[PDB]
Amino acid sequence: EENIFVMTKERAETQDIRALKIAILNLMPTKQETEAQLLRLIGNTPLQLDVHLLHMESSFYKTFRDIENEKFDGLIITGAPVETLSFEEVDYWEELKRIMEYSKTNVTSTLHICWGAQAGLYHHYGVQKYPLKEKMFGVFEHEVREQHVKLLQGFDELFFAVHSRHTEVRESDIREVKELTLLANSEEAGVHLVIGQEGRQVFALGHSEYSCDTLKQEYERDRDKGLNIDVPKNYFKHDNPNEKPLVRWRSHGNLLFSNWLNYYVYQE
Amino acid sequence: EENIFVMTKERAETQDIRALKIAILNLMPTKQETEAQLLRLIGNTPLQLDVHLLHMESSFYKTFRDIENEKFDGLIITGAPVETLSFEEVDYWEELKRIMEYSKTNVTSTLHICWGAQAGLYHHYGVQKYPLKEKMFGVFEHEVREQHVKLLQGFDELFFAVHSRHTEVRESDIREVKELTLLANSEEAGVHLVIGQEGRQVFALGHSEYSCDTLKQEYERDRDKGLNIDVPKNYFKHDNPNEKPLVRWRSHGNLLFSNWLNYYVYQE
Ligand SMILES: N[C@@H](CCO)C(=O)O
Ligand SMILES: N[C@@H](CCO)C(=O)O
Question: What is the distance between the alpha carbons of residues B40 and B211, in angstroms, rounded to a whole number?
Answer without folding.
Answer: 10
